[PDB]
């Protein structure tokens, strides 16, 4: 078999959508508040996350058929999934030789001790590194990484989603585009789809832990004041 003219247009669009929303140069990073080596890294990492939340919103709008759900469904899927997409998209900067995200600048290389200086503990960070090293080891193609993000975003089993029936449909349409792609275009990926679905379930566990840890950070005015309006709105409890 092969991919259909319609599934490939999904692939091309998702890929260009990721190309437009993910700057390989990382040059927008100097416009963030600097990184500093309690919670010296919070302003810089809050800035970094707030930026990539904006990118993920841009990615979503270009996912085939996202632009056609209720604006409320769009926001519910974006709020609940943003932190998982960010963890996903970030694999692109995680080098395994360094066990950090090196972002085109030594001021922008984030080791685990950096993220502790932004409020988080190993109960989150160590499962998170293991996720990224497991995901990097899967040596995904670009279309798989990008398909995996769109499938992650289009989960209908998140708090707030209304038209579950339809979100289910479009996510299923991408699961099958992906599954076809791996069968047809990836030599030696006879099990790879299943490895990717497990990575989605990983993401939920870390989302849970981040949420738990974020809530603790965001309930102290000392630290919430260092976040951004976009971060507070998205990772926040307000319905």
């Amino acid at each position: 078999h092969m991919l259909s003219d319609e599934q490939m247009q999904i692939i091309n669009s998702l890929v260009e959508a990721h190309h437009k929303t993910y700057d390989d140069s990382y040059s927008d990073f100097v416009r963030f508040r600097p990184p500093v080596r309690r919670l010296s890294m919070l302003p810089h990492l809050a800035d970094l996350v707030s930026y990539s939340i904006q990118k993920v919103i841009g990615f979503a709008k270009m996912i085939p058929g996202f632009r056609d759900l209720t604006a409320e469904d769009q926001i519910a899927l974006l709020k609940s999934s943003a932190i998982e997409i960010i963890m996903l998209r970030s694999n692109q900067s995680f080098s395994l030789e360094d066990m950090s995200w090196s972002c085109g600048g030594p001021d922008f290389k984030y080791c685990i001790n950096d993220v502790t200086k932004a409020g988080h503990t190993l109960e989150l960070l160590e499962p998170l590194v293991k996720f990224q090293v497991g995901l990097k080891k899967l040596k995904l193609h670009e279309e798989e990484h990008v398909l995996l993000m769109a499938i992650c975003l289009l989960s209908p089993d998140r708090p707030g989603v209304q038209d579950h029936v339809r979100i289910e449909a479009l996510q299923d349409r991408l699961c099958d585009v992906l599954q076809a792609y791996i069968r047809i275009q990836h030599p030696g990926g006879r099990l790879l789809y299943a490895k990717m679905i497990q990575k989605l379930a990983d993401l939920r566990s870390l989302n849970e832990e981040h949420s738990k840890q974020y809530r603790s950070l965001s309930f102290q005015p000392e630290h919430s004041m260092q976040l951004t309006p976009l971060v507070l709105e998205v990772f926040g409890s307000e319905v």
Binding site: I75, K79, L230, V234
Partner: peptide
Amino acid sequence: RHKIXXXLQ
């Protein structure tokens, strides 16, 4: 006050 999330529009 006022959701950033119409950065949908």
